[PDB]
Amino acid sequence: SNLIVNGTAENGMDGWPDWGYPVSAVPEAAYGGTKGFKLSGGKQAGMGQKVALKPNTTYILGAWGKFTAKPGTYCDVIVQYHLKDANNTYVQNILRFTETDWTYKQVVFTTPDAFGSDPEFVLWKDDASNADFYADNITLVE
């Protein structure tokens, strides 16, 4: 059971709030199925959704990703939340992609005993070079 809605782009951009960035669900970006997510070159771009994480629970976050040509910087896949501690610590669980062939990355993390902010998944492309980024099969599972 994937906590991310439509992590495969098989339902287009459905389940993903429009943040106004150049993110499309298109055949050229597919790792599998009929579509993948394409984050346009030339601009920073991201999308995300709130994720219903449980406390003291272990999760695996994974995704396939590639740039179409060598980028200036990177694109991150992140699950993030604040702790409910005195310092109000911000936790980012991050996969950082810079590669130009399809590359699978994953991170295993265990959630704290309480959240200080609503957990979110975020895909964020810092890079604004000419290369497009393709993301597909984005997965967050207990």
Binding-site annotation: residue ranges: 8, 10, 32, 35, 136
Give burial (CB, 10 Å; 0-12/13-18/19+) of 140: buried
Q: Which two structure tokens, joined as six digits, stand for 134?
A: 């393709």
List, as residue ranges, the binding site for Ca(2+): 8, 10, 32, 35, 136
Residue 33 interacting with Ca ion (CB under 5 A)? yes
Determine which residue in the list 9, 47, 61, 78 makes contact with Ca ion, applying CB under 5 A: 9
The residue within the footprint of Ca ion, chosen from 76, 127, 132, 136 (CB under 5 A), is: 136
- Sole binder of Ca ion in the list 3, 7, 8, 78 (CB under 5 A): 8
Using left for φ > 0, alpha for ψ between -120 and 50, and beta otherwise, residue 137 falls in left
> Tokens 């702790």, residue?
83
To the nearest whole angstrom, how small is the minimum distance from the Cβ of residue 32 to Ca ion? 5
